[PDB]
């Protein structure tokens, strides 16, 4: 029967747990329905297991500069199993920590699958057991999208990021299909570690929604790293040969004639084409809750759905798909609800983001074209530099560091910082803080530099 | 005879060159007297050659986590020569670049040693040739201090940072004497690379002028890295045995009786006790230019000496001894002089600094005690965290990451950020920009985090 609480959170991922923590910490009676493992996508099959795999690739990369630094080289041969077993243990330790905090904060964990009922007042049922609350948050997140046989015959022969983390040996030949961050990172980890990789993109470059400098630089650094970027190409079908897979792909460079080619002996085919929300089995239809054509839950600036007492945050909304954003919104909400801060909402402007490619990308703000459109070419001035990290001053293998700064108006307010280079992963957080206080280039320029670093380049751009 | 210019800069180091560049770029007729190699301390025997040696040590460190990441280990044996020859070539390329820019900007380079004359109007002479200008800047910098036989007999048997960069093989047994940044860095590079090292400090910990957390953490990380910290100890004398050196050191832990011990078979004895200014051979006495008891040139908030038309910037003044500060002040000055910005002066508050120890230290602002004294215990709240970088979640060897944030007053204005951990070298510049705009913790806290990174810890401190 309906057990009542002050807050019912559906899904124990990033947004979910943060909302429940802050909420209870403000005196509420929360419970967290979760059908699988706490932590959600991020911890089990995302941010965490990705970062470890990346570090591993970073080790692979630098093995290349060993002799250069005076040390003897190493015979090579990465063992995937060893690092996988560990990566996995780590994730378990994290899970144990998560349950611990939840219980330590007195938050129930209704285990199982939640779905709204055919009751007048918002109510959900988990195993014939119904629970209701004056405030219910849907934080079910999303999932990897795979193409159906109904369009790409043999599409179901390939894997997704989820099956990537399930992989137990280093694939011989990998084919990534997708041109966004997840694709790029998978492309780069797999390649660094030894697999022959082809990244299949429908256009000429990657991370197309990122500033032109970033997508342009990133496509190059990828190519220079041993990755094959198959431009203007898609898969028509996949067949399970005896050797491996046979990717029949259509490559149609605009201005030429289309040309089909088979990719044989493929060990792995990763679909990194998108993320579809987790909303169908919630019975959103039972309450007449608004979704878009793609299943995402439509919410307002304050995470409100169209139904009173029901909110949604994170991936499931289809906006700014990142652990920190789900957390930031789940937190702002618990405060708005249980602390009565009517204006407690997350600002989706100037959200910082790091893409763990090689070298790592960092970005916060408007791309130059996003500024030119919002301000006008007369009001947008960019500053940029392209240099080689001194780490490479003694190595044969090189990478670059390109940093761009989009300034707007007379005072030259920094509206966008984009870079890619070594250390760009830890370099970003602070400038992201500065970009949020409304810093102008002079604020950056009246900051005594730190020498010798790559960061100082941003405060001496001229 | 006296050739006249608009600006005469004495010394082509960090402060010197920046002042001349900006100056000429503003239409002046500059010349740069330099008795040695352009770039000064930093480029030839400082920032640059240090950073390369550090990167090298960082490679050594991570060689330790190779098998952990699934790769086979390496037999070891670093070759110093290889990396030294390279480090050196690099520095040459830099020198060539420096002359190039100077000439490209039409700045003369009077080669030789400058010294003021016995002329009424400020005039200097370089090789019986006299040159004068309405504005003369002394940017001679400083030099390593060594103890004289007159106190420490055999003191002249050891070397300094300068002789460190002259070293051609990896010393077998090194003894660093000094408890400040240069000492620590030399201690850590030499140790990472394979030398048995002892850091001799007159107290219990290092970097004593840094926030207590930093000096405390740093002394530990050093000890945990294979470095021997000889606390409460000094050298009484050094003798050249046949094997190597014999350091007779007095160790006097307060609360015990003093105990002398010999350190035998020492390959290297590095004096990292201090930096004395380059002012004696300038003939400062000829114009009655004010110096302090230690030879430093006394200047005001605007770099003015007590003599009209003569200024001083950088190490030679004995304040905030860093390349970026000399640059920042030489630049502010050229603008004040040639652009008539009467208030163009450098703010020595919130100068950021990175110490390249292992892991790297970063700091900007007031130490907690500097705030408690300036504000009062009732008005100072600190926040801190101590965690292990996830890079170590799979390694046996660990390091920590400790970050402290000193907040002041009701709004909790961030007056000091101190940390030590991996990536703390590139992490600092941005927070340094934020700390200068007068950011409050809420500004930091209303900054969507970047996950998974070490930096995010600073914007989620609670
Ligand atoms: C590869 C890969 C790498 C990523 N890397 C990063 C990165 O480095 N940085 C970053 O910031 N973001 C990263 N992301 C994005 C980040 O993972 C997501 O933004 C974050 O997971 C979003 O959280 P959420 O709260 O919306 O959902 P989720 O964490 O997905 O959580 C939803 C939880 O609810 C459960 N559930 C679903 N429906 C129900 C229901 N009906 N009843 C009960 N329980 C239910 C789910 O099992 C799940 O555990 C990555 C994603 C992938 C895939
Ligand atoms: C080891 C080591 C590491 C360092 N590392 C760093 C670091 O990583 N980061 C950092 O920011 N700072 C570092 N420093 C500090 C930085 O090097 C100095 O702050 C910077 O060099 C200061 O510049 P300056 O303009 O005062 O002098 P300098 O660069 O020393 O230059 C003075 C120049 O003037 C010449 N000269 C002197 N007297 C005369 C005269 N009478 N006539 C003609 N020419 C003359 C000198 O030859 C010299 O080249 C380091 C120092 C050492 C030693």
mmCIF file with all atom_site columns, N, CA and C in Angstrom, chain A residues 276-318:
data_model
loop_
_atom_site.group_PDB
_atom_site.id
_atom_site.type_symbol
_atom_site.label_atom_id
_atom_site.label_alt_id
_atom_site.label_comp_id
_atom_site.label_asym_id
_atom_site.label_entity_id
_atom_site.label_seq_id
_atom_site.pdbx_PDB_ins_code
_atom_site.Cartn_x
_atom_site.Cartn_y
_atom_site.Cartn_z
_atom_site.occupancy
_atom_site.B_iso_or_equiv
_atom_site.pdbx_formal_charge
_atom_site.auth_seq_id
_atom_site.auth_comp_id
_atom_site.auth_asym_id
_atom_site.auth_atom_id
_atom_site.pdbx_PDB_model_num
ATOM 1   N N  . UNK A 1 276 ? 19.440 7.898  -25.533 1.00 0.00 ? 276 UNK A N  1
ATOM 2   C CA . UNK A 1 276 ? 17.982 8.065  -25.499 1.00 0.00 ? 276 UNK A CA 1
ATOM 3   C C  . UNK A 1 276 ? 17.553 7.980  -24.030 1.00 0.00 ? 276 UNK A C  1
ATOM 4   N N  . UNK A 1 277 ? 16.576 8.787  -23.623 1.00 0.00 ? 277 UNK A N  1
ATOM 5   C CA . UNK A 1 277 ? 16.119 8.768  -22.239 1.00 0.00 ? 277 UNK A CA 1
ATOM 6   C C  . UNK A 1 277 ? 15.438 7.482  -21.731 1.00 0.00 ? 277 UNK A C  1
ATOM 7   N N  . UNK A 1 278 ? 15.413 7.332  -20.408 1.00 0.00 ? 278 UNK A N  1
ATOM 8   C CA . UNK A 1 278 ? 14.792 6.190  -19.744 1.00 0.00 ? 278 UNK A CA 1
ATOM 9   C C  . UNK A 1 278 ? 13.420 6.678  -19.272 1.00 0.00 ? 278 UNK A C  1
ATOM 10  N N  . UNK A 1 279 ? 12.408 6.584  -20.124 1.00 0.00 ? 279 UNK A N  1
ATOM 11  C CA . UNK A 1 279 ? 11.087 7.098  -19.752 1.00 0.00 ? 279 UNK A CA 1
ATOM 12  C C  . UNK A 1 279 ? 9.875  6.235  -20.095 1.00 0.00 ? 279 UNK A C  1
ATOM 13  N N  . UNK A 1 280 ? 10.018 5.366  -21.086 1.00 0.00 ? 280 UNK A N  1
ATOM 14  C CA . UNK A 1 280 ? 8.927  4.500  -21.518 1.00 0.00 ? 280 UNK A CA 1
ATOM 15  C C  . UNK A 1 280 ? 8.272  3.661  -20.412 1.00 0.00 ? 280 UNK A C  1
ATOM 16  N N  . UNK A 1 281 ? 9.073  2.938  -19.644 1.00 0.00 ? 281 UNK A N  1
ATOM 17  C CA . UNK A 1 281 ? 8.509  2.094  -18.600 1.00 0.00 ? 281 UNK A CA 1
ATOM 18  C C  . UNK A 1 281 ? 8.124  2.790  -17.284 1.00 0.00 ? 281 UNK A C  1
ATOM 19  N N  . UNK A 1 282 ? 8.029  4.114  -17.312 1.00 0.00 ? 282 UNK A N  1
ATOM 20  C CA . UNK A 1 282 ? 7.649  4.865  -16.136 1.00 0.00 ? 282 UNK A CA 1
ATOM 21  C C  . UNK A 1 282 ? 6.135  5.055  -16.100 1.00 0.00 ? 282 UNK A C  1
ATOM 22  N N  . UNK A 1 283 ? 5.503  4.877  -17.259 1.00 0.00 ? 283 UNK A N  1
ATOM 23  C CA . UNK A 1 283 ? 4.063  5.061  -17.399 1.00 0.00 ? 283 UNK A CA 1
ATOM 24  C C  . UNK A 1 283 ? 3.704  6.544  -17.304 1.00 0.00 ? 283 UNK A C  1
ATOM 25  N N  . UNK A 1 284 ? 4.545  7.381  -17.908 1.00 0.00 ? 284 UNK A N  1
ATOM 26  C CA . UNK A 1 284 ? 4.342  8.837  -17.928 1.00 0.00 ? 284 UNK A CA 1
ATOM 27  C C  . UNK A 1 284 ? 2.948  9.205  -18.435 1.00 0.00 ? 284 UNK A C  1
ATOM 28  N N  . UNK A 1 285 ? 2.412  8.323  -19.267 1.00 0.00 ? 285 UNK A N  1
ATOM 29  C CA . UNK A 1 285 ? 1.090  8.423  -19.886 1.00 0.00 ? 285 UNK A CA 1
ATOM 30  C C  . UNK A 1 285 ? -0.027 8.312  -18.871 1.00 0.00 ? 285 UNK A C  1
ATOM 31  N N  . UNK A 1 286 ? 0.241  7.610  -17.773 1.00 0.00 ? 286 UNK A N  1
ATOM 32  C CA . UNK A 1 286 ? -0.731 7.453  -16.702 1.00 0.00 ? 286 UNK A CA 1
ATOM 33  C C  . UNK A 1 286 ? -1.076 8.803  -16.061 1.00 0.00 ? 286 UNK A C  1
ATOM 34  N N  . UNK A 1 287 ? -0.148 9.751  -16.058 1.00 0.00 ? 287 UNK A N  1
ATOM 35  C CA . UNK A 1 287 ? -0.446 11.058 -15.464 1.00 0.00 ? 287 UNK A CA 1
ATOM 36  C C  . UNK A 1 287 ? -0.525 12.160 -16.519 1.00 0.00 ? 287 UNK A C  1
ATOM 37  N N  . UNK A 1 288 ? -0.261 11.786 -17.768 1.00 0.00 ? 288 UNK A N  1
ATOM 38  C CA . UNK A 1 288 ? -0.283 12.772 -18.826 1.00 0.00 ? 288 UNK A CA 1
ATOM 39  C C  . UNK A 1 288 ? 0.870  13.755 -18.702 1.00 0.00 ? 288 UNK A C  1
ATOM 40  N N  . UNK A 1 289 ? 2.057  13.220 -18.405 1.00 0.00 ? 289 UNK A N  1
ATOM 41  C CA . UNK A 1 289 ? 3.288  13.999 -18.240 1.00 0.00 ? 289 UNK A CA 1
ATOM 42  C C  . UNK A 1 289 ? 3.922  14.267 -19.599 1.00 0.00 ? 289 UNK A C  1
ATOM 43  N N  . UNK A 1 290 ? 4.217  15.534 -19.832 1.00 0.00 ? 290 UNK A N  1
ATOM 44  C CA . UNK A 1 290 ? 4.771  15.980 -21.096 1.00 0.00 ? 290 UNK A CA 1
ATOM 45  C C  . UNK A 1 290 ? 6.195  15.553 -21.398 1.00 0.00 ? 290 UNK A C  1
ATOM 46  N N  . UNK A 1 291 ? 6.354  14.998 -22.603 1.00 0.00 ? 291 UNK A N  1
ATOM 47  C CA . UNK A 1 291 ? 7.640  14.573 -23.155 1.00 0.00 ? 291 UNK A CA 1
ATOM 48  C C  . UNK A 1 291 ? 7.751  15.180 -24.563 1.00 0.00 ? 291 UNK A C  1
ATOM 49  N N  . UNK A 1 292 ? 8.945  15.130 -25.144 1.00 0.00 ? 292 UNK A N  1
ATOM 50  C CA . UNK A 1 292 ? 9.151  15.626 -26.501 1.00 0.00 ? 292 UNK A CA 1
ATOM 51  C C  . UNK A 1 292 ? 9.098  14.439 -27.457 1.00 0.00 ? 292 UNK A C  1
ATOM 52  N N  . UNK A 1 293 ? 9.260  14.711 -28.746 1.00 0.00 ? 293 UNK A N  1
ATOM 53  C CA . UNK A 1 293 ? 9.208  13.651 -29.742 1.00 0.00 ? 293 UNK A CA 1
ATOM 54  C C  . UNK A 1 293 ? 10.161 12.487 -29.441 1.00 0.00 ? 293 UNK A C  1
ATOM 55  N N  . UNK A 1 294 ? 11.274 12.756 -28.750 1.00 0.00 ? 294 UNK A N  1
ATOM 56  C CA . UNK A 1 294 ? 12.269 11.721 -28.424 1.00 0.00 ? 294 UNK A CA 1
ATOM 57  C C  . UNK A 1 294 ? 12.155 11.053 -27.044 1.00 0.00 ? 294 UNK A C  1
ATOM 58  N N  . UNK A 1 295 ? 11.068 11.316 -26.323 1.00 0.00 ? 295 UNK A N  1
ATOM 59  C CA . UNK A 1 295 ? 10.891 10.696 -25.018 1.00 0.00 ? 295 UNK A CA 1
ATOM 60  C C  . UNK A 1 295 ? 11.432 11.474 -23.834 1.00 0.00 ? 295 UNK A C  1
ATOM 61  N N  . UNK A 1 296 ? 12.198 12.532 -24.073 1.00 0.00 ? 296 UNK A N  1
ATOM 62  C CA . UNK A 1 296 ? 12.747 13.336 -22.986 1.00 0.00 ? 296 UNK A CA 1
ATOM 63  C C  . UNK A 1 296 ? 11.631 13.958 -22.207 1.00 0.00 ? 296 UNK A C  1
ATOM 64  N N  . UNK A 1 297 ? 11.840 14.134 -20.910 1.00 0.00 ? 297 UNK A N  1
ATOM 65  C CA . UNK A 1 297 ? 10.828 14.760 -20.076 1.00 0.00 ? 297 UNK A CA 1
ATOM 66  C C  . UNK A 1 297 ? 10.985 16.278 -20.138 1.00 0.00 ? 297 UNK A C  1
ATOM 67  N N  . UNK A 1 298 ? 9.936  16.955 -20.600 1.00 0.00 ? 298 UNK A N  1
ATOM 68  C CA . UNK A 1 298 ? 9.891  18.412 -20.733 1.00 0.00 ? 298 UNK A CA 1
ATOM 69  C C  . UNK A 1 298 ? 9.733  18.973 -19.321 1.00 0.00 ? 298 UNK A C  1
ATOM 70  N N  . UNK A 1 299 ? 10.619 19.904 -18.948 1.00 0.00 ? 299 UNK A N  1
ATOM 71  C CA . UNK A 1 299 ? 10.617 20.576 -17.638 1.00 0.00 ? 299 UNK A CA 1
ATOM 72  C C  . UNK A 1 299 ? 10.920 22.059 -17.852 1.00 0.00 ? 299 UNK A C  1
ATOM 73  N N  . UNK A 1 300 ? 10.612 22.879 -16.857 1.00 0.00 ? 300 UNK A N  1
ATOM 74  C CA . UNK A 1 300 ? 10.886 24.297 -16.973 1.00 0.00 ? 300 UNK A CA 1
ATOM 75  C C  . UNK A 1 300 ? 12.229 24.674 -16.342 1.00 0.00 ? 300 UNK A C  1
ATOM 76  N N  . UNK A 1 301 ? 12.480 25.973 -16.214 1.00 0.00 ? 301 UNK A N  1
ATOM 77  C CA . UNK A 1 301 ? 13.708 26.533 -15.644 1.00 0.00 ? 301 UNK A CA 1
ATOM 78  C C  . UNK A 1 301 ? 13.984 26.113 -14.224 1.00 0.00 ? 301 UNK A C  1
ATOM 79  N N  . UNK A 1 302 ? 12.943 25.669 -13.536 1.00 0.00 ? 302 UNK A N  1
ATOM 80  C CA . UNK A 1 302 ? 13.024 25.210 -12.158 1.00 0.00 ? 302 UNK A CA 1
ATOM 81  C C  . UNK A 1 302 ? 12.851 23.705 -11.998 1.00 0.00 ? 302 UNK A C  1
ATOM 82  N N  . UNK A 1 303 ? 13.005 22.965 -13.096 1.00 0.00 ? 303 UNK A N  1
ATOM 83  C CA . UNK A 1 303 ? 12.910 21.498 -13.141 1.00 0.00 ? 303 UNK A CA 1
ATOM 84  C C  . UNK A 1 303 ? 11.537 20.925 -12.985 1.00 0.00 ? 303 UNK A C  1
ATOM 85  N N  . UNK A 1 304 ? 10.552 21.803 -13.094 1.00 0.00 ? 304 UNK A N  1
ATOM 86  C CA . UNK A 1 304 ? 9.140  21.444 -12.990 1.00 0.00 ? 304 UNK A CA 1
ATOM 87  C C  . UNK A 1 304 ? 8.628  20.786 -14.259 1.00 0.00 ? 304 UNK A C  1
ATOM 88  N N  . UNK A 1 305 ? 7.873  19.695 -14.129 1.00 0.00 ? 305 UNK A N  1
ATOM 89  C CA . UNK A 1 305 ? 7.269  19.055 -15.300 1.00 0.00 ? 305 UNK A CA 1
ATOM 90  C C  . UNK A 1 305 ? 5.956  19.825 -15.458 1.00 0.00 ? 305 UNK A C  1
ATOM 91  N N  . UNK A 1 306 ? 4.998  19.307 -16.219 1.00 0.00 ? 306 UNK A N  1
ATOM 92  C CA . UNK A 1 306 ? 3.746  20.046 -16.375 1.00 0.00 ? 306 UNK A CA 1
ATOM 93  C C  . UNK A 1 306 ? 2.739  19.665 -15.291 1.00 0.00 ? 306 UNK A C  1
ATOM 94  N N  . UNK A 1 307 ? 3.096  18.629 -14.547 1.00 0.00 ? 307 UNK A N  1
ATOM 95  C CA . UNK A 1 307 ? 2.288  18.105 -13.473 1.00 0.00 ? 307 UNK A CA 1
ATOM 96  C C  . UNK A 1 307 ? 2.858  18.613 -12.148 1.00 0.00 ? 307 UNK A C  1
ATOM 97  N N  . UNK A 1 308 ? 1.991  19.196 -11.315 1.00 0.00 ? 308 UNK A N  1
ATOM 98  C CA . UNK A 1 308 ? 2.378  19.733 -9.998  1.00 0.00 ? 308 UNK A CA 1
ATOM 99  C C  . UNK A 1 308 ? 2.912  18.623 -9.104  1.00 0.00 ? 308 UNK A C  1
ATOM 100 N N  . UNK A 1 309 ? 4.001  18.902 -8.392  1.00 0.00 ? 309 UNK A N  1
ATOM 101 C CA . UNK A 1 309 ? 4.578  17.917 -7.494  1.00 0.00 ? 309 UNK A CA 1
ATOM 102 C C  . UNK A 1 309 ? 5.458  16.869 -8.133  1.00 0.00 ? 309 UNK A C  1
ATOM 103 N N  . UNK A 1 310 ? 5.770  17.034 -9.428  1.00 0.00 ? 310 UNK A N  1
ATOM 104 C CA . UNK A 1 310 ? 6.665  16.130 -10.174 1.00 0.00 ? 310 UNK A CA 1
ATOM 105 C C  . UNK A 1 310 ? 7.706  16.989 -10.912 1.00 0.00 ? 310 UNK A C  1
ATOM 106 N N  . UNK A 1 311 ? 8.979  16.627 -10.757 1.00 0.00 ? 311 UNK A N  1
ATOM 107 C CA . UNK A 1 311 ? 10.110 17.371 -11.320 1.00 0.00 ? 311 UNK A CA 1
ATOM 108 C C  . UNK A 1 311 ? 11.013 16.390 -12.015 1.00 0.00 ? 311 UNK A C  1
ATOM 109 N N  . UNK A 1 312 ? 11.970 16.887 -12.779 1.00 0.00 ? 312 UNK A N  1
ATOM 110 C CA . UNK A 1 312 ? 12.909 15.994 -13.470 1.00 0.00 ? 312 UNK A CA 1
ATOM 111 C C  . UNK A 1 312 ? 14.222 16.705 -13.595 1.00 0.00 ? 312 UNK A C  1
ATOM 112 N N  . UNK A 1 313 ? 15.316 15.977 -13.430 1.00 0.00 ? 313 UNK A N  1
ATOM 113 C CA . UNK A 1 313 ? 16.650 16.544 -13.574 1.00 0.00 ? 313 UNK A CA 1
ATOM 114 C C  . UNK A 1 313 ? 17.640 15.557 -14.211 1.00 0.00 ? 313 UNK A C  1
ATOM 115 N N  . UNK A 1 314 ? 18.652 16.121 -14.865 1.00 0.00 ? 314 UNK A N  1
ATOM 116 C CA . UNK A 1 314 ? 19.682 15.329 -15.505 1.00 0.00 ? 314 UNK A CA 1
ATOM 117 C C  . UNK A 1 314 ? 19.428 14.825 -16.913 1.00 0.00 ? 314 UNK A C  1
ATOM 118 N N  . UNK A 1 315 ? 20.185 13.808 -17.314 1.00 0.00 ? 315 UNK A N  1
ATOM 119 C CA . UNK A 1 315 ? 20.081 13.216 -18.646 1.00 0.00 ? 315 UNK A CA 1
ATOM 120 C C  . UNK A 1 315 ? 18.637 13.035 -19.183 1.00 0.00 ? 315 UNK A C  1
ATOM 121 N N  . UNK A 1 316 ? 17.721 12.596 -18.325 1.00 0.00 ? 316 UNK A N  1
ATOM 122 C CA . UNK A 1 316 ? 16.340 12.341 -18.725 1.00 0.00 ? 316 UNK A CA 1
ATOM 123 C C  . UNK A 1 316 ? 15.622 13.535 -19.371 1.00 0.00 ? 316 UNK A C  1
ATOM 124 N N  . UNK A 1 317 ? 16.142 14.735 -19.145 1.00 0.00 ? 317 UNK A N  1
ATOM 125 C CA . UNK A 1 317 ? 15.569 15.955 -19.709 1.00 0.00 ? 317 UNK A CA 1
ATOM 126 C C  . UNK A 1 317 ? 16.178 16.271 -21.043 1.00 0.00 ? 317 UNK A C  1
ATOM 127 N N  . UNK A 1 318 ? 17.306 15.637 -21.331 1.00 0.00 ? 318 UNK A N  1
ATOM 128 C CA . UNK A 1 318 ? 18.004 15.835 -22.585 1.00 0.00 ? 318 UNK A CA 1
ATOM 129 C C  . UNK A 1 318 ? 18.767 17.140 -22.685 1.00 0.00 ? 318 UNK A C  1
#
